Design a protein around this ligand. Sequence first.
Ligand SMILES: Nc1ncnc2c1ncn2[C@@H]1O[C@H](COP(=O)(O)OP(=O)(O)NP(=O)(O)O)[C@@H](O)[C@H]1O
Ligand SMILES: Nc1ncnc2c1ncn2[C@@H]1O[C@H](COP(=O)(O)OP(=O)(O)NP(=O)(O)O)[C@@H](O)[C@H]1O
Ligand SMILES: [Mg+2]
Ligand SMILES: [Mg+2]
Ligand SMILES: [Mg+2]
Ligand SMILES: [Mg+2]
Lengths: 671, 672
Amino acid sequence: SLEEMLTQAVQEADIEQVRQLLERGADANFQEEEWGWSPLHSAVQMDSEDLVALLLKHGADPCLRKRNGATPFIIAGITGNVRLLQLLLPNVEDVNECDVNGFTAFMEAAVYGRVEALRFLYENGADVNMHRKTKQDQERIRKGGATALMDAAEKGHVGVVTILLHAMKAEVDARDNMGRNALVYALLNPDDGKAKAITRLLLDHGADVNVRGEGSKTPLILAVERKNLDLVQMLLEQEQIEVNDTDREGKTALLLAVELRLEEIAKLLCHRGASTNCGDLVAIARRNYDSDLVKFLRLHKNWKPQSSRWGEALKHLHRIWRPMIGKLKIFIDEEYKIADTAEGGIYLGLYEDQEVAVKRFSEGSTRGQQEVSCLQSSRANDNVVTFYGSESDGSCLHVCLALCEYTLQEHLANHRGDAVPNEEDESARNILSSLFKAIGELHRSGYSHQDLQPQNILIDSKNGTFLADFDKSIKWAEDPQKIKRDLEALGLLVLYVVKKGDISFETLKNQSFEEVIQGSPDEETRDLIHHLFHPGEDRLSSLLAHPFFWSWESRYRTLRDVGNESDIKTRNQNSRILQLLQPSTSFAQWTTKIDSFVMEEMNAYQDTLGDLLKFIRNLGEHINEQKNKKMKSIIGEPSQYFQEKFPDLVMYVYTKLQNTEYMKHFPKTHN
Amino acid sequence: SLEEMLTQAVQEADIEQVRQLLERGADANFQEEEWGWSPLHSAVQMDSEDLVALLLKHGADPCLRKRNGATPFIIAGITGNVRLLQLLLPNVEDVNECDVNGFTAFMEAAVYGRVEALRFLYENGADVNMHRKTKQDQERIRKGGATALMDAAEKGHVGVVTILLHAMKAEVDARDNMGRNALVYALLNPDDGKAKAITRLLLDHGADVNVRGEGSKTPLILAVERKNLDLVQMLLEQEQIEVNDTDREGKTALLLAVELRLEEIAKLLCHRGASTNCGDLVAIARRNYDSDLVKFLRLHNWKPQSSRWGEALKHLHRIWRPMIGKLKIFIDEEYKIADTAEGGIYLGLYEDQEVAVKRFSEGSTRGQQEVSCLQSSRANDNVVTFYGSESDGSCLHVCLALCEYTLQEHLANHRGDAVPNEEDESARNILSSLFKAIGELHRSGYSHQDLQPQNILIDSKNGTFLADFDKSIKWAEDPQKIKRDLEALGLLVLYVVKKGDISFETLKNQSFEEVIQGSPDEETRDLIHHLFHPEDRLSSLLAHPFFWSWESRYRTLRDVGNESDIKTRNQNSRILQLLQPGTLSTSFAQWTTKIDSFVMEEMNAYQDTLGDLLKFIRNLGEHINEQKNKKMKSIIGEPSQYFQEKFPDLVMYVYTKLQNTEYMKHFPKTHN
Ligand SMILES: Nc1ncnc2c1ncn2[C@@H]1O[C@H](COP(=O)(O)OP(=O)(O)NP(=O)(O)O)[C@@H](O)[C@H]1O
Ligand SMILES: Nc1ncnc2c1ncn2[C@@H]1O[C@H](COP(=O)(O)OP(=O)(O)NP(=O)(O)O)[C@@H](O)[C@H]1O
Ligand SMILES: [Mg+2]
Ligand SMILES: [Mg+2]
Ligand SMILES: [Mg+2]
Ligand SMILES: [Mg+2]
């Protein structure tokens, strides 16, 4: 708290307290840790000569560099006070000392328009034509290399430019590391008057007119894009200029002029030799309702969409002309409409030339902010609809998403006739495990959905299932109890998908827990829905190991593997395994529910669960043998047989063995 | 080709050919399918009265609407020719007829600055204060509702604005559906002179100064952001103005003024009652090196997800930086992830998400290759997640999901996780992700060209992602280069299986033969073979036994050894014909001698055929854990590992014999 008192004293301009603290023995060369500012740096910055003299008196170091490598002398160029420069100069080894990005005191005087300081630094040996030397990482991307002239041109300091060219012998056509000259920088200055003056000065002294800036634009193109007739005239006076040069996108100055409704600029370019073959200029001028330009122009002369459902319209949208909204191409017409929304709608779009679905909100919409906020945090979530980005025009927030084919509701309806009635539903399993992963990672990211329902779940070309509608999402830290509403709706969605869309979601929403459970067609489904209604943060990832997600072959495999334990086969009643299994079921009296034929042959068995497992293992191993042709024909597919006959068996075994060493008999599962 | 000749004749202004074609019997009401343009619409648009009169003579319909619902009369407002308006008016039912977005002839005359047409339409009953009625989808996002005054203000037509307010009784404070008035529109006009004039006119007639535009900005804030002292003065003259109002981000006009180095504007706001408590204005003015403004002012929880990068990410979140679009970044060694060819990888925050930022020259061909490929790969789950890109004047910043480690670094960090001969599950997962990544990349029309361990990234969750696309190409150009990816993938298979012990450069200097010879097992050899000698080749190979777990391989052998024809040793069965058509240099020739002496005797209470080996594996499998067999169990150890180490070619041999037969059913469930 000695040098910290000094620092605040210098800021507040308290000179006597600075004297006292300096004589009490406080370090004048203290540099604060974050940005390396010293009291001297601060004194020069605040333009206070009394503190500068006082600090130097007590041995402040004028060679001291802050984090960006700037010294107090460099900073003095910024402030532009010649007296501070004079005072510091004797202690300065090199007047052209630079910071880590290449800035000298002279350059800073040019950037900040400090004329007196510029003159003083020139007279004391400043290199007027020094290029900024910078770090290796900057040089390798062609940054750095700018001069004082370029800076002064960019910032619109006409006086400085005049003086640099006339009194200080500045190189008019010097180039930075990207190949730009002062003329390019001059045309980036938004002030029209200063840009016009500086451009004339530069052109008069022989600035090269055929150079390139950003996007490989020429000075002529920059002048057209800025819609300035005078700058265009000025530039077209130079007879060496190349009027038909193209920017990186292949656009010529004429083409841009017609596109931007610049009639006079366009005529002037034609008269100075610009070619009509750069584009369909007539159609463009017509489109703009530039009647006179159309007459003048008349006188003087593969893409494939990925989406099947939306492909035809996507092709048409690619074909037509539209103005861009940042990276988005879109046209509000019924041909390109996907669906209604609360806020006017989902439309097809092209974003960075990728097909997308575009959800449109009012730019002030609270829900649009909820949607975009959640999507911005969910880009790593593979089971969430892929977010491309967003674009505002004046009024509408456009949220661009991966284009999907169908809603889960529509998808289930399209495929409702695929399966033979008691076929195993593999696709239900895949749909739901994606949703578990989606919702699980969404919660991990701190968000809750609030609206999980079949029309917010999207299926893509590859039959991938994605979670989609986040306009009502919330950060759950606010109200943790609302995470349970997601899990409940997920329970409903489990039944919805398992019933193949036959029972509407609204019907399911109007049922009690008990009724939902009673409406389930099997025990795996019942138990799973139970755990979602009574959870009750990796609950969802752990439930992927639940037997609802085990295939029928895997369930049958597990039963057989348990029925092969030596203690089951020897019927050792005091074994750990039979302990576990023997503690109101469909397999009570199981030997009577099996077919009469089958039971007799296998006997060449008691009503215990251990013996049922033993039975399943034995039948499993010997069912396909030639002697057992009749057995095989009666039972049919054995996994389906035992499950239909004993619906609670798989869940019962799972529950008894769940956290024992006999987990090893469960199938390999996701993790 | 009758009405198509007419259309071109009208465009070329060929009046006599139009007469002939009209009398040859061509429909004057033909509307081209795409945009619904008729010859009459086209005639009015090109400002040709002779064609307009001639077309109307032959029964052209002036009520005819094109795709956007505009009639020839509406278009006449755009062109602004009063004579065409006079000519069409008698046939027009309502002078205020509008298109689907609400535009009338009057409004169009205002938008396009057509003064004579504006006057004519006013005198013939135009509703000056009509709000644009538009479609339901537009209204529900609060678009539409603009007036002629707003349009004229927006487009900088001072004459029209003057005339609307003074001669035509325009409502100065009317509002569109978003709640904006003509004053907001006036301040969006980039021409300073016209903006200043129109603003004065509007303010003089009593435009409400406390309104909101985009981002909930006020007219005062718009004036500050546009850096115009005169517009600020003009607005601060109104004594009802609220100087301390905030935009959606909580910024006040003063705060913005200081941030943008607007000394005079800032002083003027302070004098007119703006409060200093809107932010730390002194620190901001200091930061900007606005010394005089500093003197004047003096007188008057976030958590990063990344463990490796978290500390530096916290620091970057804490400091002040200017934004490059959506990207916050600072080029300093503390935030540097790595060197590149061009500019390096630095930590960044993009839409407040932590990212790795790869920097290119804005003109870099490589940078265009990288961004092009990433733009097409957003659906590819096994490619590093692309957030977006941002250019400043010079540098293209490509923003990616921040990963922890390279595959090379990851393998080195975890080299001691596994016991001597443990099954390498993680190698399998790493490689199947890469197969899927590269497979979908090719499907998107792209080739990588540089697949190597330092271009593969592992994230916090141990997910593996493909990453460096500066040398990617569209392969349609040269399809043969797709093979270079598959070759490098073969190298990466060995690299990962050898756990990073053999460097990738070593592997790159070897021939196909040497790579194969350097593999530690038969599954790996066969897989690498199919990658060197190859469209989902790479999705089909996920079914290859390299990706089968040891339990699955053992399960398959047992399941084959349970076939009834194997157990009865029925030599003429289809199954035994597949596995052992008679004369072997396999490792399981004479297999009964290579098994332990003890084990063989007990199971005998067996021939040197493959069928009997399978039979043996099934029997041992079913009875190994029984109490009587305690010694057997202890000698064999884990049986899957036992048979595989004893008979290294057995799994591949069975796979190959049964590959496309009905006995595929014994293979494990696989990805698809
Ligand atoms: N990315 C997409 N790809 C294809 N269809 C989509 C996509 N996003 C949304 N949709 C469809 O458009 C509808 C838009 O609904 P949504 O995004 O849920 O907005 P919402 O305002 O919540 N709609 P509502 O369900 O009517 O309130 C969905 O039901 C889908 O049919
Ligand atoms: N998204 C990322 N997250 C974390 N580290 C990354 C990320 N992207 C790249 N890197 C790291 O930084 C290096 C950048 O290399 P890369 O993106 O391959 O550019 P490059 O020019 O090909 N590099 P070089 O291999 O030097 O040519 C990688 O090897 C990684 O170590
Ligand atoms: Mg919805
Ligand atoms: Mg919704
Ligand atoms: Mg690399
Ligand atoms: Mg590279």
